[PDB]
């Protein structure tokens, strides 16, 4: 069922080295911002978690 997995999300100004294309519940994904960009909280990296709702957070970085 659709609430049992998460697709790889769209990235914006960020990369991942994770090579999986879909994720089970509680699986995680690490991202890193492009140089010159930062997360919503000011970090250059983040980790996001697949849940019933979708992703806990999205790999979008913002120009510093």
């Amino acid at each position: 069922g659709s609430h049992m997995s998460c697709d790889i999300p769209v990235f914006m100004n960020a990369r991942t080295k994770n090579d999986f294309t879909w994720f089970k519940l509680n699986d995680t994904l690490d991202y890193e911002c492009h140089d010159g960009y930062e997360s919503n909280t000011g970090s250059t990296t983040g980790s996001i978690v697949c849940g019933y709702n979708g992703w806990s957070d999205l790999p979008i970085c913002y120009e510093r």
Binding site: S39, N40, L58
Partner: protein, 82 residues
């Protein structure tokens, strides 16, 4: 009916992808948590309507479902400021 179902699936997916893309484009550090909530919701709507489409038995039902998906997506977006 197989071809029509495929076209309907593509239309629903493309509209959701468009609106997710617009949500990303306008995101900012301040708006980021809105973007996450909204994008998850849009993908949930997408899955609901793709599932209805796959089991549909008529072309007119497909047209209704495409229209309903678009409306639900637009309604979700409307819950947040532009």
């Amino acid at each position: 009916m197989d071809s029509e179902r495929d076209k309907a699936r593509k239309e629903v997916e493309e509209y959701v992808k468009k609106i997710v893309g617009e949500s990303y484009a306008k995101s900012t550090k301040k708006r980021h948590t809105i973007t996450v909530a909204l994008v998850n919701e849009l993908n949930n709507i997408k899955n609901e309507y793709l599932n209805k489409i796959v089991e549909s038995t008529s072309e007119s039902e497909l047209q209704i479902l495409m229209m309903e998906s678009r409306s639900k997506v637009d309604e979700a977006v409307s819950k947040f400021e532009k």
